[PDB]
Design a protein around this ligand. Structure first.
Ligand SMILES: [Mg+2]
Length: 234
RNA sequence: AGCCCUAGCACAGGUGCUGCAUGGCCGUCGUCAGCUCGUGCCGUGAGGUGUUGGGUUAAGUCCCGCAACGAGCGCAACCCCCGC
């Protein structure tokens, strides 16, 4: 049930913080704001959800990335409402390109899982029961959705692409397709598959990013409810 | 045969020169918080990033932040004495 839910509160965004490359996907500057053409969101959306459905039904791996204010949490939900990996707090230098190395973090994080459950559940020179047990905080806080990713992803899905362009950079560096929700902030030409929208409105980020996660499972049956995502939607 | 004695021979011996041919060992900047590597990233390149920044420490000690993520030689800790 799309169409009207788009123009709900999720159509147009920014003003004169713009990229002229995005000139095609705009209805008009009326009122001094940019209002983005909805008809062309839909057009782009099918082409995007097609890519999604196919990658999914061939049993792929989409890596989700949203590290901005209003994405932050809706991402770690819909990522796992889909059993898919995500990056949530901090995109690190070479998650995709130094992968093998950034991976010996995960390697060694769950070597500590193997000391939270151990004959060392209450022992070891007790100023390591923070030093280590607090090292597992950094490892926790960051590698939450990166831990499940075990070989480079098949796509990546970005929420604000100019916000997160150090990711996109590396995607392309490895020919990994890039799906992004983009708005006038941003440069389409290096989004591989484009959801031209509002990068900011939490209503928007939710409406879209969730409905993409219908597909991701409804290409495998057992579709769920309206799903845990209205963090404090107000 | 050994071992000894004189006549030879091959050799020994030299605190004789060269620390600007060396080894080892010491002193010095200085117990100063530094000096680097792996891979990634930036740069035509020498190189850079990392190791800069903000707070903090005796300290590159820790912390928050960040195209970096880690590691090695250091610092601290593992040894000795002194305190209960
Ligand atoms: Mg130059």
């Amino acid at each position: 049930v799309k169409e009207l839910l788009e123009a709900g509160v999720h159509f147009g965004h920014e003003r004169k913080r713009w990229n002229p490359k995005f000139a095609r996907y705009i209805y008009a500057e009326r009122n001094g704001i940019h209002i983005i053409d909805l008809q062309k969101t839909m057009e782009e959306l099918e082409r995007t959800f097609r890519f999604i459905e196919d990658l999914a039904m061939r049993g792929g791996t989409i890596l989700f990335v949203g590290t901005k204010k209003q994405a932050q949490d809706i991402v770690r939900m819909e990522a796992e409402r889909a059993g898919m990996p995500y990056v949530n707090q901090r995109w690190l230098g070479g998650m995709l390109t130094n992968f093998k190395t950034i991976s010996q973090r995960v390697h060694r994080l769950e070597e500590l899982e193997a000391l939270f459950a151990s004959p060392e559940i209450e022992e070891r020179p007790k100023k390591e029961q923070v030093r280590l047990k607090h090292e597992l905080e950094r490892l926790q806080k960051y590698l939450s959705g990166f831990r499940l990713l075990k070989r480079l992803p098949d796509a990546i899905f970005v929420v604000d692409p100019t916000k997160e362009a150090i990711a996109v950079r590396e995607a392309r560096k490895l020919f990994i397709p890039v799906i992004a929700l983009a708005d006038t902030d941003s440069d389409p030409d290096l989004v591989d598959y484009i959801i031209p929208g509002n990068d900011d409105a939490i209503r928007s980020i939710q409406l879209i990013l969730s409905r993409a996660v219908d597909l991701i499972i409804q290409a495998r049956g057992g579709v769920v409810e309206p799903s845990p995502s209205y963090a404090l939607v107000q």
